[PDB]
Every structure is written in C-alpha cells, then in structure tokens.
Design a protein around this ligand. Sequence first.
Ligand SMILES: C[C@@H](O)c1nc2cnc3[nH]ccc3c2n1[C@H]1CC[C@H](CCC#N)CC1
Length: 292
Amino acid sequence: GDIVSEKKPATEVDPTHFEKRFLKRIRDLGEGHFGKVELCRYDPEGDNTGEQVAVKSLKPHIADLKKEIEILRNLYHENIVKYKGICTGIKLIMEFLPSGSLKEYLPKNKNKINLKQQLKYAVQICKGMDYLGSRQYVHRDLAARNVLVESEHQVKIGDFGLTKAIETDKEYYTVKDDRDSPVFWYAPECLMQSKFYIASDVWSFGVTLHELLTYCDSDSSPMALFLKMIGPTHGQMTVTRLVNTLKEGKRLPCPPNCPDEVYQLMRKCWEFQPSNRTSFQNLIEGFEALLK
Ligand SMILES: C[C@@H](O)c1nc2cnc3[nH]ccc3c2n1[C@H]1CC[C@H](CCC#N)CC1
C-alpha cells in the first residue's frame, strides 16, 4: 500500500548544541599554531540579538581539541571560563568576556587597578589553579594572556589547550610535543626533563604574577626581561642559556612599585626544586594575609 516511513521521535533541544548555520563570525580573539578563538554571535533569530560567544576551532589535532572540550565541559568554578557547548569536525563554544585577557585589560586600566585589586586577582588565579590541581590536571600554559577579565573584580582562567591529566598515584606528566613551549614561563624540570608537576604550574603562576604586577607592559614582559638577562641573539641555544641562568639562581627582578613582601611570595614560586616550592593554598594564605 502506502509508502512506509519512520515514525519521528519527539526531538528535544540540547542547549549545549550550537548549529553551524546560526553561528556567525564577528572577529578573531586570539590563536596558537593549531587552534584559534573567534568572537561569534549565535543568532538563530537572525536579527543580531543572539548572544555573543567565544568559539575555539582548529586551523586548517582534532583528538586534542576533543580532549580539551571534555576537560572544560567538566570544570565548574567561578574562576574558570564557562563551557557553553559544541558545534559539530568540532568547535568549542565558551562564554565571551569583552574585557579580554589581562594583556588587553591591564595596560588600559592601570588607573582603576591598584595593588589591592592585583592581589585579589592573584588569589582568584590561585583558586582556579588549585581547583584544576584537585581534578588532577596540570595546565602547562599559565600566563597573563590566558587569564580573562570578567569584571574589574573578577578574573577567570580562559584556555586549556595544553592541559593534561596527571595519572593517579603519579606525580607528573611527561611531554613529547614541546616545539611551541612558552619557555620563559617554564620551570627547570619542564625545560630540562620535560616533566610537568602541579609545582610546575606554581612556577608559571609566579611569572604570571610578575606580568600582573607590571600591568602586562610589553617592555617588561618575562620574555623581554629574560632576553635582556641572557642575550637576545642566541637562536637555538636560548633555552640552555635560560636553564643555566636559572641554575645560577638568577630570577626575574622585583617589579617597580611591588613591595618586597609581595616579591617574596613570588620568589617562593621559583625554588629551583619542585618539592621546595610553595603551594597554591599557601599563596592564597599569603595574599589574604597581605589584604587584611
Ligand atoms: C582578546 C583575547 O585575549 C580574548 N578575549 C576573549 C574573550 N572571551 C574568551 N573566551 C574564551 C577565550 C576568550 C578570549 N580571548 C583569548 C583568550 C586566550 C585564547 C588562547 C587560546 C587560543 N587560541 C584566545 C582567545
């Protein structure tokens, strides 16, 4: 008799599924060598009223992006950027923070952001990082460019492209791809043996705190300052030159107008040996003591 077809199941909406046809690119926000993030509007009504979102996609590594999505999808913390969903190849949809990262926000808001507010941001970054460490992750890319500004009073860790799980009962993750490491943010064990501990993120945090205290000025950046300390024309010998400097005991200097008590907390992040470094919880205590 009549053509047979399939009875249609009632289709619910998944609020975490973003349809490609409604996701409209506004502009680039940032990138790496394999990934990039764009500002889009998700505009199903087509009248430019939809919400703005940050969209992370691959540059023309799918497995790594899917792993990043699964990591972020399951992080819930006020100082970690919010997962919104996916668009499926696959794109990661996150909340968009108009102020951008500390690199964008700090140079423009020096007058508004005093030492007290910097310390509160420092606490917030530590709380986010301590949460990540409690989920048994190492971030491996903690720098001011990856700290987003939600408001004058709040920051969030805003990218997880290099984040890796540390195996249960084990203490570090060993890295293989290292061609694009942010070496001027990396602890010695990372630079020398390619091992990543939670203590390695504490080291990076120290450097990120330096950036925050210098309002992310490009002439005071950890790279600029290190290249001054070791020489800017060593090419492929740069990292060995860096490693030796750190071995000698040389560190980034105290930022202008940074009180010594703040600088001492920073130096505890940079004990040459991972086991000798401060923890994120102890940093929080330290900053809070300075705020009260
Ligand atoms: C301006 C730029 O720093 C920026 N503004 C953002 C606003 N909302 C966002 N939500 C998620 C990221 C994000 C944002 N990012 C950058 C943060 C760092 C990443 C780095 C990883 C890549 N690609 C690029 C986008």
